[PDB]
Amino acid sequence: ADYQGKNVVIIGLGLTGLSCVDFFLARGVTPRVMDTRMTPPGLDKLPEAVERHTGSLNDEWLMAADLIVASPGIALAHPSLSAAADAGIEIVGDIELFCREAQAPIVAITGSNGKSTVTTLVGEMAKAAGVNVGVGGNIGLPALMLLDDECELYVLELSSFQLETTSSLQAVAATILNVTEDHMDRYPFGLQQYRAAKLRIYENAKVCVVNADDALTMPIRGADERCVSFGVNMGDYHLNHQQGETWLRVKGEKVLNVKEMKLSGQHNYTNALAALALADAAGLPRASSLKALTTFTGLPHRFEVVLEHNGVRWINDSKATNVGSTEAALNGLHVDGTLHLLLGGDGKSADFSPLARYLNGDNVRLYCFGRDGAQLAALRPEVAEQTETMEQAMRLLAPRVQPGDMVLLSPACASLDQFKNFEQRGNEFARLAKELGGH
Ligand SMILES: Nc1ncnc2c1ncn2[C@@H]1O[C@H](COP(=O)(O)OP(=O)(O)OP(=O)(O)O)[C@@H](O)[C@H]1O
Ligand SMILES: [Ca+2]
Ligand SMILES: [Ca+2]
Ligand SMILES: [Ca+2]
Ligand SMILES: [Mg+2]
Ligand SMILES: [Mg+2]
Ligand SMILES: [Mg+2]
Ligand SMILES: [Mg+2]
């Protein structure tokens, strides 16, 4: 597209907004930028010629714009943006700008949880094929930074927020991995509204990869000829268990024993299936995509086995900051002895009820900590202990573990009551797992 001579205003001075600034500067357009934070991090990366306004939005800048480029972190519903749209001012986001310029096929991945794992996995499948693939859309590598005429394939992780401002995406393959109660703040009309944002990803997609086990991932008008499904018990791509073994199965044919993979957990096996369905639909060779499933290490803090010693697996699932993540970790969970389950932190007023139906059984112990520990111990008081901190809980369980056991940090809560971020929490869990379980 051609932006010469336009009055362009960018909202957000994070990495995403900075990538938008770079995009317009590379095209000879000097945009204006604003951020409601007084001193956003990106401020001191800006060139001198870019006018900037911080500490709030600048309504007259917005109302004079030819094009508003909104960070995903501000709502289309914010009064200033509603006022601009009422005036007929075009509002887009960075993904919309990307889609207008992308000259290679796009694989597009959204969902409440698992996006980063599936996105990275599809990227590995492309790399195994020798494809110069560009992988991004997370806050840490914004899509506009991927744009390059040498790129042969784009793999984008897309949030519901980015999708709300995107209209030009024509994915060669797209998925909604799952939809669970999250981002409730931004979706005042509930789960079907949050869903409608994610459903935009299928607009003009050539192939829709849907979750057979989550009907909210189906396209808005229902299943159609574009749809390929992945699931646990059935679907085009599904899981097969027998003789104590598990296989990935595609259209009636086993394709891989999961013992060749390095990921653990049924939900990561379904992530593998979704990734393979997307890669297949994108035209990547099956052989190299299966090879990627055997080399993919997984991402830190996502159901990550950090220690396996003396028959005890220690699993860092610190990135399970919400209930749907932990529920997925407990569903179909394979443990031969006792599960020692670490829950706690700032639960953000979540309903933890869903976790209850997994915590019966003679082989479960709960260790609950942080701000909301008491709520979590309430799930099943008989098998629960409550401490202030994760380290205290780990010291409580470490002398009790036996071969066959699993120690799972799947907190279902944010970490900010006691840690700088979930990465520090996961890193601390790994340090203590090795201190207490390695020797
Ligand atoms: N298919 C899945 N369903 C539910 N939870 C999952 C699934 N795959 C992974 N998880 C868990 O969800 C948490 C987040 O994983 P991941 O970082 O891949 O998600 P995401 O969608 O990228 O998240 P974000 O919205 O923060 O970008 C981790 O606990 C991971 O184990
Ligand atoms: Ca802002
Ligand atoms: Ca206590
Ligand atoms: Ca956190
Ligand atoms: Mg001024
Ligand atoms: Mg999210
Ligand atoms: Mg992510
Ligand atoms: Mg079902």
Q: Decide if 33 contacts 46 (C-beta within 8 A).
A: yes
Clarify whether 138 is annotated catalytic.
yes
Closest-CA residue to 380 (of 437, 341, 420, 433): 341
Q: Please state, in angstroms and rounded to a whole number, the distance separating the CA atoms of residues 431 and 150.
A: 42
Q: Decide if 370 contacts 418 (C-beta within 8 A).
A: yes
Closest-CA residue to 25 (of 41, 47, 43, 42): 47
Q: Which atom of ligand 1 is nearest to the CA of 157?
A: 22
Catalytic residue, candidates 6, 78, 127, 183: 183
Q: Is 322 buried (19+), middle (13-18) or exposed (0-12) by CB count in 10 A?
A: buried
- In short, whether 198's Cβ falls inside 6 Å of ligand 1 is no
How is the chain split into domains, by residue range?
8-91, 96-295, 304-437
Q: Which atom of ligand 1 is nearest to the CA of 139?
A: 27
Q: Please state, in angstroms and rounded to a whole number, the distance separating the CA atoms of residues 173 and 315.
A: 32
The H or E element spanning position 268 is helix 266-282
Give me 54's structure tokens.
Answer: 């911080």
Q: Do domains 96-295 and 304-437 have the same CATH topology?
A: no
Residues at the binding site for ATP are 111-117
Q: In which region does residue 298 sit, left (phi positive, over 0), alpha (psi from -120 to 50) or beta (all else)?
A: left
Clarify whether 301 is annotated catalytic.
no
8-state DSSP, 339 = E
Clarify whether 45 is annotated catalytic.
no
CB within 8 Å of 3: residues ≥ 6 apart? 24, 27, 29, 67
Cα–Cα separations (whole angstroms), residue 81 to 65, 76, 90, 182, 271: 12, 6, 10, 23, 36
* Cα of 113 from ligand 6 centre, angstroms: 7
Q: Which fold has domain 96-295?
A: UDP-N-acetylmuramoyl-L-alanine:D-glutamate ligase (3.40.1190)
CB within 8 Å of 397: residues ≥ 6 apart? 340, 365, 367, 407
* Cα of 137 from ligand 3 centre, angstroms: 40
DSSP states of 40-85:
-GGGGGS-TTS-EEESB--HHHHHH-SEEEE-TTS-TTSHHHHHHH
Helices 422-437/390-397 angle, 10° precision: 30
Q: Which fold has domain 8-91?
A: Rossmann fold (3.40.50)
Closest residue (by CA) to atom 5 of ligand 1?
325
Beta strands at 312-316 and 339-344: parallel, antiparallel or unpaired: unpaired
State the resolution, in angstroms. 2.0
The CATH class of 304-437 is alpha beta
- In short, whether 328's Cβ falls inside 6 Å of ligand 1 is yes
* Cα of 303 from ligand 1 centre, angstroms: 9
